[PDB]
Amino acid sequence: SGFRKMAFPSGKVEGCMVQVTCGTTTLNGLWLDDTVYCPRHVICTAEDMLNPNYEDLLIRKSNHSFLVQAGNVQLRVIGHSMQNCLLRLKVDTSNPKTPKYKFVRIQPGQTFSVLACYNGSPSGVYQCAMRPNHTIKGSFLNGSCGSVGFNIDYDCVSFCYMHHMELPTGVHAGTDLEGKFYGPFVDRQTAQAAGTDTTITLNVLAWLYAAVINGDRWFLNRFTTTLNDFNLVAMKYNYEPLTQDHVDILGPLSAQTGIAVLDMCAALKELLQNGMNGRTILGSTILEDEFTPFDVVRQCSGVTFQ
Amino acid sequence: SGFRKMAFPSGKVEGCMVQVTCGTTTLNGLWLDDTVYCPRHVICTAEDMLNPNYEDLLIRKSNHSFLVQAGNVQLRVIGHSMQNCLLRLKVDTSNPKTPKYKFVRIQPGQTFSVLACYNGSPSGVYQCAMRPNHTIKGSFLNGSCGSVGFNIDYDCVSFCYMHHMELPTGVHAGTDLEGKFYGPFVDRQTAQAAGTDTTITLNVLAWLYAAVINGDRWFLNRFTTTLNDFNLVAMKYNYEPLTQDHVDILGPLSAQTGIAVLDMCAALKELLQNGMNGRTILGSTILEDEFTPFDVVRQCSGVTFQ
């Protein structure tokens, strides 16, 4: 029993973190096989960040412009290229600790683990959801950029995030491991801001199913609702519209608990209109939206506490 | 910016997790040098758990009664002893992945990282506080016992918890790595229950300092208080009494933010009596008590957002 925001064990990623230095700028890189990945912003100087032309800044560099440090060992760069907002540095040593991996572009609403790192040294690990507005509420200080986000699937690490910037509201933005930003953000100093966000409806419903699996039914009711009537309430409370696809995804959780998805939606509607009346759900006084259906099935028992 | 419950990177502990089998019972063990540590409950049968005599159950075992599996490799037990509520199995191979480590007995209020494990395979990692009533609000299913709790100090892993049981309220209990239980619990099936708990005052104050370091001052006020007047309010709201030692510990955070500890206590008192009036603190609608002063200094910037 219990229910916590659980991260994936981080060892397989820890063995991939390196330090990349260009000029006066140091940040983190990801070393897989004979390639190091890092934010291309490493090549900017303290006067370059307003309107840096990365094509122009990079042509002016050589392989030995880049210092890559793996622990106390210095790796030699024998090649370099730009891929979107990342640099790819070829090095003369293949990472012996390379795990099985893939690069994936995650969808909004989906969760992953972040290994926060400074100067190539892992510092902490925590779970994050990709917000609908394509930012994450991370925890990051200066020098964290190049820290990565991942999920682990058996022995395979699916890398999905590399950190690049903090936005004015203190939330965070970055790219996939192909260097394409999540969201409309750019790696230069502008007036960019997070767009308005919304609550991840599918994840709140997932979490209500987790609460029932863990033995709590207090918030249920005798009503049902149609998708459309639910969605009228949803927009009132700044929730994502629920779709038939989302209803289908909740099938397994619905089967395990014997509660119809649209009946759970009726419960949510009531929670939204009436509040929680001093009560908690899985320890929480608020409706949580950073657990996916997948996250609930991973962590919760396969047999419910009836 | 941001503020999250951050766990320590778990790789150094992942390389220490093994599977221990005796009879029909399988659970997790911790392999350091040539010793495997695990809960002594591994030697009970399905009819032994009411009043097992572990001295009696163990004398009846040999070294080959125990099957220890490290990944796909079988370790051979060449010795065994009981230390309080743990077994210590000597094996014929020293763990090549042994990190620098120590065993520590943590105090209530203190936090650590849990590496949740099943059948010797790490599954997830999350941060926990040792409650004043000596339980933890973990997330654990059948087969998690022998999962460990730890803190990491440079390259040194300080092991402080090994998991043994779930109590009737769904909270968790275990021992230090000398096999001594935290709390009055015993490793047998009885009517034992968690005693009443209280909020960790020192940690709530720490977290209020974190909120100010991160730029938020809304909850402050123009008042101060004495220790004694604060403590009158504290017992009303089921908070730990604040002591001069706790005031002294908050010194560094007090200096960084320019807010006197007893002035922050006046703020807490007001929060306790008046509520949060629809507002949040570091994203939270409630007062959080699972971050220590140490945790705040580890994660927060050393320069406050004035």
Ligand SMILES: Cc1cc(S(=O)(=O)c2c([N+](=O)[O-])cc(C(F)(F)F)cc2[N+](=O)[O-])c(Cl)cc1Cl
């Ligand atoms: C990719 C990257 C960006 C920055 S940044 O200078 O700090 C930065 C950037 N940025 O990416 O160039 C954009 C923005 C904004 F415009 F999006 F707000 C804000 C910041 N910032 O936190 O000062 C730093 Cl230091 C390091 C890296 Cl690796």
Ligand SMILES: Cc1cc(S(=O)(=O)c2c([N+](=O)[O-])cc(C(F)(F)F)cc2[N+](=O)[O-])c(Cl)cc1Cl
């Ligand atoms: C050390 C240990 C205990 C149990 S236990 O059978 O599950 C157990 C124990 N226990 O430790 O013997 C005590 C209590 C209680 F009395 F404290 F409530 C409750 C349980 N339980 O969750 O069924 C299991 Cl399976 C595995 C281990 Cl390694």
